[PDB]
Amino acid sequence: MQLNPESADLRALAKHLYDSYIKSFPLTKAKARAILTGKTSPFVIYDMNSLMMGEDKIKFKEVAIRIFQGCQFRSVEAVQEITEYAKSIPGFVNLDLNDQVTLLKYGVHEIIYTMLASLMNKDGVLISEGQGFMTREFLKSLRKPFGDFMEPKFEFAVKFNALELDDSDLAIFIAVIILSGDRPGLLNVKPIEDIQDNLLQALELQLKLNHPESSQLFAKLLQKMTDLRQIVTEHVQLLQVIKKTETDMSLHPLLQEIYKDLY
Ligand SMILES: CN(CCOc1ccc(C[C@@H]2SC(=O)NC2=O)cc1)c1ccccn1
């Protein structure tokens, strides 16, 4: 490894993505872990009683449905943030507009679960920008099939968080996921692939500098890119079950359009 014009540009790219990341996302991993460890306080929701008291304290029908709808609305909101961030990725807006919409379409959920890991520990998940904390066991206490909803996410998060990536690692990682040339229905694959190769170089450089304690981190991360897709995959199958069983759930129409091409 050498300090040359190429690597200097890669460092500039990483710094740029990090700045955009900080501006695009309200709650960083750095601020999130501090809260999760008290170094800073959220209303903890751990049972039905604290759930009701909490809906009345934190500034945000049947309980399971309310919660599930809360996740949908948070999700739609996140799509907005992810989109704003994607536009700051060098080259992204110069792509054919349809490919931009396609990339985001097949990428937002992978990123959503990536970033949700930052807000999780083994006990639960931060909600409403850190105003609240909903416990893992409370989510499992929700009636079938909603009690199985979040558990794959927690399991992924616990493994992912062991990698101990920080926000400047995640800033590049999320860009790499977005610029996947293998999404269905892309018009111009090569320019997309060119940008990702560049992002992947920046990412490898970043991990080497930022994590001197591990030479396996880059390969472990590329492996996680696949776990993510499986989680989306597994999540849509569970969505069909919710449909072919319970008619009292109205799925947000924006998400509907995304899930159309995910079946
Ligand atoms: C558990 N939390 C935190 C958010 O946790 C999430 C879990 C899953 C998603 C994916 C959504 S849900 C769906 O089916 N399709 C999507 O895009 C998005 C967020 C909340 C948040 C608000 C109210 C109640 N609880």
Curated annotation (Swiss-Prot):
Induction info reads: (Microbial infection) Expression increases when incubated with M.tuberculosis or its lipoprotein LpqH; induction is TLR2-dependent (at protein level).
One of this protein's GO BP terms? positive regulation of miRNA transcription
Q: What is known of its domains?
A: The 9aaTAD motif is a transactivation domain present in a large number of yeast and animal transcription factors.
Provide the NR LBD domain boundaries: 9-261
Region listing for Interaction with FAM120B, in residue ranges: 2-48
Keyword annotations for this protein? Answer: Activator, Biological rhythms, Cytoplasm, Diabetes mellitus, Disease variant, DNA-binding, Glycoprotein, Isopeptide bond, Metal-binding, Nucleus, Obesity, Phosphoprotein, Receptor, Transcription, Transcription regulation, Ubl conjugation, Zinc, Zinc-finger
Keyword Transcription attached = yes
Source superkingdom: Eukaryota
Native species: Homo sapiens
Output this protein's name: Peroxisome proliferator-activated receptor gamma
Q: What cellular-component terms does GO give this entry?
A: chromatin; cytosol; intracellular membrane-bounded organelle; nucleoplasm; nucleus; receptor complex; RNA polymerase II transcription regulator complex
Q: Provide the tissue specificity.
A: Highest expression in adipose tissue. Lower in skeletal muscle, spleen, heart and liver. Also detectable in placenta, lung and ovary.
| Protein purpose | Nuclear receptor that binds peroxisome proliferators such as hypolipidemic drugs and fatty acids. Once activated by a ligand, the nuclear receptor binds to DNA specific PPAR response elements (PPRE) and modulates the transcription of its target genes, such as acyl-CoA oxidase. It therefore controls the peroxisomal beta-oxidation pathway of fatty acids. Key regulator of adipocyte differentiation and glucose homeostasis. ARF6 acts as a key regulator of the tissue-specific adipocyte P2 (aP2) enhancer.
User: What interactions and quaternary structure are annotated?
Assistant: Interacts with FOXO1 (acetylated form). Heterodimer with other nuclear receptors, such as RXRA. The heterodimer with the retinoic acid receptor RXRA is called adipocyte-specific transcription factor ARF6. Interacts with NCOA6 coactivator, leading to a strong increase in transcription of target genes. Interacts with coactivator PPARBP, leading to a mild increase in transcription of target genes. Interacts with NOCA7 in a ligand-inducible manner. Interacts with NCOA1 and NCOA2 LXXLL motifs. Interacts with ASXL1, ASXL2, DNTTIP2, FAM120B, MAP2K1/MEK1, NR0B2, PDPK1, PRDM16, PRMT2 and TGFB1I1.
GO MF terms, alphabetically ordered: alpha-actinin binding; arachidonate binding; chromatin binding; DNA binding; DNA binding domain binding; DNA-binding transcription activator activity, RNA polymerase II-specific; DNA-binding transcription factor activity; DNA-binding transcription factor activity, RNA polymerase II-specific
Residues reported to bind rosiglitazone: 72-75, 109, 235, 259
The annotated modulation of its activity is: PDPK1 activates its transcriptional activity independently of its kinase activity.
Per its UniProt record, which disorder involves this protein? Answer: Defects in PPARG can lead to type 2 insulin-resistant diabetes and hyptertension. PPARG mutations may be associated with colon cancer.
Task: Name where it mostly resides.
Answer: nucleus
Residues annotated as transmembrane: none
